[PDB]
Design brief:
The structure is a homodimer.
Chain A (H helix, E strand, L loop, with lengths): L1 E2 L6 E6 L2 E7 L7 E2 L9 E6 L4 E14 L2 E9 L6 E2 L1 H4 L5 E3 L1
Parallel strand pairs in A: 3-8, 4-7
Antiparallel strand pairs in A: 2-3, 2-6, 5-6, 6-7
The complex binds ligand 0Q4.
Ligand 0Q4 sits at the interface of chains A and B.
């Protein structure tokens, strides 16, 4: 759909069979989800944001539904202030910025 | 225009008489520009994201041109790793997320 930006672009996602709310973040290269149990093997990764760097668990090829759209890709799990859907998955659902 | 998300959505902006590259960030409530000697008064603010918080100076009614589109609003100036155009200004240029 078309999402304006007067409110945070929050969407419902389904990951690991669990529903969550996440923010479509064009400023995120990656997808970072709050600490949770996720089925699959993972690798320790460090990612940076506005305030610094954090350690995350990198899960590859994770199936996730974002606003009713399917994406299968890298999901980082860690102490992020909010669940964020980055460009790696936004490109999968055909999301573009327009003005 | 339409901006795909294969790459970081960087656009040219003009603020305080300077041209800079900024990231269109739908996950940013506010706009934060790299440290620059902007005149006028401001008030201290702390903004956070992945990794923690950074202290910035908050300037109100700052005019910024984003990819040729004029906007006027609140701009935070501080030690940000990249110039970020948030929702407060993206709404002014009529930017939407589409998929
Ligand atoms: C081996 C490579 C591994 C990959 C790894 N990649 C990264 O770290 C890349 C660059 N990081 C990013 O792209 C990260 C997101 C995490 C991620 O994608 O991994 N992006 C980001 O963190 C971008 C800004 C940014 C972009 C690029 C570089 C640096 C910074 N911000 C994302 C973020 C989303 C938010 C909901 C948590 N928004 C914000 O941080 C903004 N914050 C907000 O909008 C609010 N929290 C308001 C602040 C609080 N207000 C207050 N106290 N009154 C801020 C910019 C004003 C590399 N570093 O190591």
């Amino acid at each position: 759909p078309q999402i304006t930006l007067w409110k945070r672009p929050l969407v419902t996602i389904k990951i690991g069979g669990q529903l969550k709310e996440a923010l479509l973040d064009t400023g995120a290269d990656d997808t970072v989800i709050e600490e949770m149990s996720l089925p699959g093997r993972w690798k320790p990764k460090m990612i940076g944001g506005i305030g610094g760097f954090i350690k995350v668990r990198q899960y590859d090829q994770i199936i996730i539904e974002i606003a009713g759209h399917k994406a299968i890709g890298t999901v980082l799990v860690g102490p992020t202030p909010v669940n964020i859907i980055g460009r790696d998955l936004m490109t999968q659902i055909g999301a573009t910025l327009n003005f």
